[PDB]
């Protein structure tokens, strides 16, 4: 799809390991994602956890993306003028952790994962700005 | 998919670490490229150096692609029946360098970068071949 161009855009600055555009409404599945990443295997039930009414459970139980265990660092997904969440992978041992930001537009979610050592502020701004762009275009 | 399919054809035999399709006429910018690599960052000014009238300065001076310093190994971009160039990244402290081949069709340039150890000859054939296909197709 043409949605791969959005992945390209999110990857262009070299600070992200992967990116994705994911529907969360009727077309509740991955629309475009970096190949070989965890984002490409995000599932509808994982999407429901990100966007659902319960904004508490994931603090207690974590969540997964592409079956990868993660922690929720900040939830502003339904905060007007923000519409982001900050996430971090869990270290199975063993391996570095990676920061994840999610931006919520009207129809789609924007996911970015930083490379090793890339902090979450810059990622949040990226997710925010793209989700805002998409909201204003009707998405 | 659009021009992404051409990137994918360039990448599918495994010898490359990135590829790109780049216009040099009306739309003088990158059209499709491996996400998060060097080629996606090629600038119009760098395009102008690749396709410009001066075919000698870049031997003495090198050139950049995506701000990465490179050497010109062979220039045949305006040799009819060939229309390629051979380029190599420069090492700053002994880290590996990579070969780059460029093919020029009528409207677009084909860029390919080898994996470590991949020689320029096969890359040149790849770039030649795709640029010839595009040329024969009116591009």
């Amino acid at each position: 799809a043409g949605w791969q161009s959005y992945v390209d855009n999110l990857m262009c600055d070299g600070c992200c390991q992967e990116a994705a555009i994911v529907g969360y409404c009727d077309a509740k599945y991955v629309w475009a994602a970096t190949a070989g990443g965890v984002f490409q295997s995000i599932t509808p039930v994982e999407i429901d956890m990100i966007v659902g009414k319960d904004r508490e459970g994931f603090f207690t139980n974590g969540l997964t993306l592409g079956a990868k265990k993660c922690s929720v660092i900040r939830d502003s997904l339904y905060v007007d003028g923000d519409c982001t969440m900050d996430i971090r992978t869990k270290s199975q041992g063993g391996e570095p952790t990676y920061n994840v930001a999610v931006g919520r537009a009207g129809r789609v979610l924007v996911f970015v994962m930083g490379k090793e050592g890339v902090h979450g502020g810059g990622l949040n701004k990226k997710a925010y700005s793209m989700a805002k762009y998409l909201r204003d275009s009707g998405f | 998919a659009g021009w992404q399919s051409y990137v994918d054809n360039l990448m599918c035999d495994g010898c490359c670490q990135e590829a790109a399709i780049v216009g040099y006429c009306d739309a003088k910018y990158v059209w499709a490229a491996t996400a998060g690599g060097v080629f996606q960052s090629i600038t119009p000014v760098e395009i102008d150096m690749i396709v410009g009238k001066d075919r000698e300065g870049f031997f003495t001076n090198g050139l950049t692609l995506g701000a990465k310093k490179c050497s010109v190994i062979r220039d045949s971009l305006y040799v009819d029946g060939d229309c390629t160039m051979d380029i190599r990244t420069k090492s700053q402290g002994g880290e590996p360098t990579y070969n780059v081949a460029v093919g020029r069709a009528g409207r677009v340039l084909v860029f390919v970068m080898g994996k470590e150890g991949v020689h320029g000859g096969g890359l040149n054939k790849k770039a030649y071949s795709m640029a010839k296909y595009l040329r024969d197709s009116g591009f």
Partner: peptide, 16 residues
């Protein structure tokens, strides 16, 4: 899924 908003000429066909 719907086509995206704009963020290049159409390519020629590939073989096959």
């Amino acid at each position: 899924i719907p086509p995206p908003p704009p963020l290049i000429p159409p390519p020629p066909p590939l073989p096959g």
